[PDB]
Amino acid sequence: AQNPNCNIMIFHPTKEEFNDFDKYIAYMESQGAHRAGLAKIIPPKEWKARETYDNISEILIATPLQQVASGRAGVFTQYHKKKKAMTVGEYRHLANSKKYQTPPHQNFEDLERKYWKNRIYNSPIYGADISGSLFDENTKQWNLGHLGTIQDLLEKECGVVIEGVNTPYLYFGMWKTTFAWHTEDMDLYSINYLHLGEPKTWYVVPPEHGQRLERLARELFPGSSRGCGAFLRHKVALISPTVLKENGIPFNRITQEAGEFMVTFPYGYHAGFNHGFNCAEAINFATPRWIDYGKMASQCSCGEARVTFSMDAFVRILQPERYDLWKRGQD
Ligand SMILES: O=C(O)CNC(=O)C(=O)O
Numbered sequence: 001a002q003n004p005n006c007n008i009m010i011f012h013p014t015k016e017e018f019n020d021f022d023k024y025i026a027y028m029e030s031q032g033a034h035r036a037g038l039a040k041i042i043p044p045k046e047w048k049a050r051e052t053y054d055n056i057s058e059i060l061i062a063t064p065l066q067q068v069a070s071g072r073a074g075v076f077t078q079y080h081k082k083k084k085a086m087t088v089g090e091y092r093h094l095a096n097s098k099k100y101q102t103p104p105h106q107n108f109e110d111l112e113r114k115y116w117k118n119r120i121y122n123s124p125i126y127g128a129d130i131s132g133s134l135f136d137e138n139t140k141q142w143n144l145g146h147l148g149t150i151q152d153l154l155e156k157e158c159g160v161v162i163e164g165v166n167t168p169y170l171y172f173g174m175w176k177t178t179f180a181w182h183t184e185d186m187d188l189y190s191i192n193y194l195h196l197g198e199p200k201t202w203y204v205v206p207p208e209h210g211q212r213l214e215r216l217a218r219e220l221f222p223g224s225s226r227g228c229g230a231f232l233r234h235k236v237a238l239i240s241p242t243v244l245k246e247n248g249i250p251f252n253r254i255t256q257e258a259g260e261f262m263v264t265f266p267y268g269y270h271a272g273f274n275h276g277f278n279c280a281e282a283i284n285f286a287t288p289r290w291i292d293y294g295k296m297a298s299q300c301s302c303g304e305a306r307v308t309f310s311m312d313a314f315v316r317i318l319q320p321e322r323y324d325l326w327k328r329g330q331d
């Protein structure tokens with residue numbers, strides 16, 4: 001078995017290997033990359049996502065989210081308070097202000113320590129989940145707005161045509177902005193490209209061990225667990241590396257820098273934080289190996305999770321028994 005310890009693998013494709021996205025995902029899996037839940041892909045030196053980032057300041061962040069925490073430093077939830085719209089230029093200035101800027105630090109490890117010690121005492125503002133793309137239309141390789149769609153994959157594997165579309169999202173971050181522990185909707189893959197700015201630290205649990213994280217989470221968030229049989233779908237719970245280590249949960253960590261791709265694999269729980277002002281683009285995707293995970297994916301039916309138009313059809317075709325109850329949640 002390849003990569004039996006489930007370590008995060010880092011790939012350096014050549015320009016010739018970068019032409020065929022599907023084939024390269026399959027190659028990474030042949031080397032065991034999926035066992036970690038997360039892989040890093042450093043593009044060839046010939047490649048570029050676009051020519052410059054000099055003209056992005058007028059993009060609107062219609063609903064910036066202030067991420068307010070409750071709990072203790074290592075075990076907390078966050079809720080998203082909606083703020084007034086602002087441009088990317090206004091958001092960058094805010095991120096760089098004395099109130100929100102990254103503190104002085106020695107290295108990524110010192111910054112990580114400061115994040116876990118102090119995150120709960122601040123409420124950074126995240127420009128998340130903004131439909132759009134920063135890839136130039138002439139970038140032919142690994143262009144996240146030009147991937148094969150998940151609806152087409154389902155049709156190719158299973159023979160059934162379904163409604164729905166699949167488009168990317170932009171994320172503008174600042175110091176301490178946080179992504180809570182989650183897997184993707186319907187346990188899909190994701191791919192994330194860090195266009196510019198400061199790094200993003202990721203934590204991940206191997207897919208084969210995901211239920212261990214779920215059992216810990218039920219213990220640590222006991223009211224939430226009673227409310228919903230899949231409450232990590234709400235994307236609000238944080239658990240620190242120290243707490244995971246104390247409870248024997250297998251995980252790994254890695255820092256993504258500007259110019260790098262990260263891929264999350266089906267049922268790979270992940271969480272993390274931004275080091276300072278940055279912009280990332282991400283989208284979900286599928287492969288033939290995903291279909292069996294999609295059929296088995298948990299779902300939030302308490303109603304909190306409220307998820308894209310296109311998820312309907314995946315539940316309807318892959319999970320017909322659940323269908324009914326799940327759509328009662330979403331209406
Ligand atoms: O970058 C973020 O805030 C969150 N991204 C992801 O969870 C992803 O790409 O799967």
Ligand SMILES: [Mg+2]
Nearest residue numbers: 056057058059
């Ligand atoms: Mg602009």
Ligand code: NI
Nearest residue numbers: 183184190264
């Ligand atoms: Ni994700």
Ligand SMILES: [Zn+2]
Nearest residue numbers: 228300302304
């Ligand atoms: Zn729920």
